[PDB]
Amino acid sequence: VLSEGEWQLVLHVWAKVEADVAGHGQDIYIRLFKSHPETLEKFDRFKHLKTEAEMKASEDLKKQGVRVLTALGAILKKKGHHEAELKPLAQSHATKHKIPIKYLEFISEAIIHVLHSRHPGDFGADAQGAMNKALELFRKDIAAKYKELGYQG
Ligand code: HEM
Ligand SMILES: [Xe]
Ligand SMILES: [Xe]
Ligand SMILES: [Xe]
Ligand SMILES: [Xe]
């Protein structure tokens, strides 16, 4: 369980992401696909992209990144009271997309890396620890829903 102070560290960096969610999403996807290329294979619409240049130029990838970060932002804004928000996401990611918890760990890593790079003013050590705790909680709760849904993750 995060403290209110921890949630505020999470929300204060998220406020900066929201200056330009699209640009943040592009950086996060590029980082994910570069660091863990296997994750790109899960994307029917994007697995053909060969280079960072192609990734940057993809309007559909940009739009997907906006969807991801906005869905995650809504979850973070619930400050742990995210049962309703997690249900459709867990179901689609377990059953349609088939995304293991390991890959959620990878995207969490990419999120942290991009925030660390872009936002040293709001992503010092305490803020990074708070964001890690929030993402760990997210993954814990997704993992529990995965198991309810019959997916080992
Ligand atoms: C922060 C964690 C993530 C969030 C909040 C998130 C959110 C979303 C949302 C909102 C959608 C569209 C609605 C849906 O189908 O549920 C989506 C689609 C999708 N997600 Fe995720 N996602 C996350 C992580 C991942 C990861 C790590 C992968 C694969 C490695 C993945 C694979 C996909 C795929 C393949 C789609 C369909 C994309 C398309 O329309 O072409 N997701 N995700
Ligand atoms: Xe993203
Ligand atoms: Xe997810
Ligand atoms: Xe995550
Ligand atoms: Xe969360």
From Swiss-Prot:
UniProt-recorded Gene Ontology molecular function terms: heme binding; metal ion binding; nitrite reductase activity; oxygen binding; oxygen carrier activity; peroxidase activity
Modified sites of kind Phosphoserine: S3
GO cellular component: extracellular exosome; sarcoplasm
Effect of G121A: In metmyoglobin
Modification sites for Phosphothreonine: R67
Subcellular location(s) of the protein: Cytoplasm, Sarcoplasm
The entry's keywords: Cytoplasm, Heme, Iron, Metal-binding, Muscle protein, Oxidoreductase, Oxygen transport, Phosphoprotein, Transport
Enzyme Commission number: 1.7.-.-, 1.11.1.-
Keyword Transport among UniProt keywords: yes
Domain Globin: from-to ranges: 1-147
Job description of the protein: Monomeric heme protein which primary function is to store oxygen and facilitate its diffusion within muscle tissues. Reversibly binds oxygen through a pentacoordinated heme iron and enables its timely and efficient release as needed during periods of heightened demand. Depending on the oxidative conditions of tissues and cells, and in addition to its ability to bind oxygen, it also has a nitrite reductase activity whereby it regulates the production of bioactive nitric oxide.
Quaternary context: Monomeric.
Protein family: Belongs to the globin family.
PANTHER family in the record: MYOGLOBIN
UniProt-recorded name of the protein: Myoglobin
Classification lineage: Eukaryota, Metazoa, Chordata, Craniata, Vertebrata
